[PDB]
Amino acid sequence: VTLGEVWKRQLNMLGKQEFERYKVSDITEVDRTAARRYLKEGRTDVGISVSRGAAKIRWLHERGYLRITGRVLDLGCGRGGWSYYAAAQKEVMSVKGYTLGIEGHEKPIHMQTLGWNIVKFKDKSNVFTMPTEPSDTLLCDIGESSSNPLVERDRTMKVLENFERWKHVNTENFCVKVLAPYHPDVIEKLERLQLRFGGGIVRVPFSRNSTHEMYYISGARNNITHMVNTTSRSLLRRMTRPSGKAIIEGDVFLPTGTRS
Ligand SMILES: C[n+]1cn([C@@H]2O[C@H](COP(=O)(O)OP(=O)(O)OP(=O)(O)OC[C@H]3O[C@@H](n4cnc5c(=O)[nH]c(N)nc54)[C@H](O)[C@@H]3O)[C@@H](O)[C@H]2O)c2nc(N)[nH]c(=O)c21
Ligand SMILES: C[S@@+](CC[C@H](N)C(=O)[O-])C[C@H]1O[C@@H](n2cnc3c(N)ncnc32)[C@H](O)[C@@H]1O
Numbered sequence: 001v002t003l004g005e006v007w008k009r010q011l012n013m014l015g016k017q018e019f020e021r022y023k024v025s026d027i028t029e030v031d032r033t034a035a036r037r038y039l040k041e042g043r044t045d046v047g048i049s050v051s052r053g054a055a056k057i058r059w060l061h062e063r064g065y066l067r068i069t070g071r072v073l074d075l076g077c078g079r080g081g082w083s084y085y086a087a088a089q090k091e092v093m094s095v096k097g098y099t100l101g102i103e104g105h106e107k108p109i110h111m112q113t114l115g116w117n118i119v120k121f122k123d124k125s126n127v128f129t130m131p132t133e134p135s136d137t138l139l140c141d142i143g144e145s146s147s148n149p150l151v152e153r154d155r156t157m158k159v160l161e162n163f164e165r166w167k168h169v170n171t172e173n174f175c176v177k178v179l180a181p182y183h184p185d186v187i188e189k190l191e192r193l194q195l196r197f198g199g200g201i202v203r204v205p206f207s208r209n210s211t212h213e214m215y216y217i218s219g220a221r222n223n224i225t226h227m228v229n230t231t232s233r234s235l236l237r238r239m240t241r242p243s244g245k246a247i248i249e250g251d252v253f254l255p256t257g258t259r260s
Pocket of ligand 2: 050051053054077079081082098099101102106126127128142143
């Protein structure tokens with residue numbers, strides 16, 4: 001029915017090699033070699049990011065989609081890539097990161113990058129069961145992929161309901177992952193949230209062609225439906241004519257040390 005529904009069906013039909021070629025086609029990508037090399041040797045002192053995910057929040061911040069300010073809540077922080085990026089920013093006073101930590105390599109990793117001493121992590125935290133707390137900047141990077149679009153729809157709606165709960169009057173800045181934005185129920189929900197909170201939706205170019213994820217952000221106003229369909233059309237175009245090639249750029253590097 002929607003363009004994004006056509007995209008998901010066709011994606012699931014792709015052959016193994018077609019899939020691998022398509023997923024990286026014309027996407028942007030950070031080179032993670034330096035970070036991985038330093039992490040393998042346990043070098044927590046060096047100015048590197050713990051995850052690939054940090055490239056998404058840098059693009060959001062640097063391109064004017066998101067201000068990062070005051071007390072920041074990082075929901076679904078995982079390793080801490082968004083938390084440590086935030087801690088390094090001028091206007092930030094503290095970061096609190098919450099994550100399930102269901103798997104070992106998805107638990108917070110301590111670093112000594114700038115402002116590490118103003119970050120607190122709590123793993124074994126379900127942000128859906130816990131009471132909300134005030135924030136000036138609310139981040140949420142939750143949404144597990146599924147080949148089943150109905151599963152992805154439910155996951156997305158669950159994340160958006162909890163976001164509305166966590167989103168306080170209080171909260172000026174926000175960035176929330178919308179796993180599968182193309183579902184009519186998801187669009188209708190985002191539209192009512194936009195009436196309440198403002199903002200708009202953006203597609204981060206570091207996302208792989210194999211997911212339709214977009215981000216609901218405070219920093220811009222735009223038409224939800226127009227933005228989602230434009231992404232759907234881009235992803236379909238890339239499928240019929242796949243370059244099989246990502247544009248590689250430099251990773252997220254950080255200053256190091258404590259902040260007062
Ligand atoms: C395998 N597969 C999937 N689809 C379809 O594509 C969608 C996206 O999932 P896809 O596996 O990229 O991503 P995830 O489900 O999130 O898994 P995963 O690799 O575990 O990604 C999650 C984790 O990977 C981590 N990650 C980051 N960088 C890398 C990396 O460079 N390599 C790997 N393996 N993981 C990375 C990242 O941090 C994140 O936590 C699925 O829903 C299906 O519709 C397929 N379709 C066809 N036709 N053929 C296929 O073989 C096929
Ligand atoms: C995409 S990862 C976070 C990546 C992170 N922004 C980074 O750059 O390192 C999403 C994380 O959210 C966590 N998560 C999923 N559901 C959650 C829940 N209900 N409460 C807290 N964390 C959750 C997952 O365990 C996963 O590690």
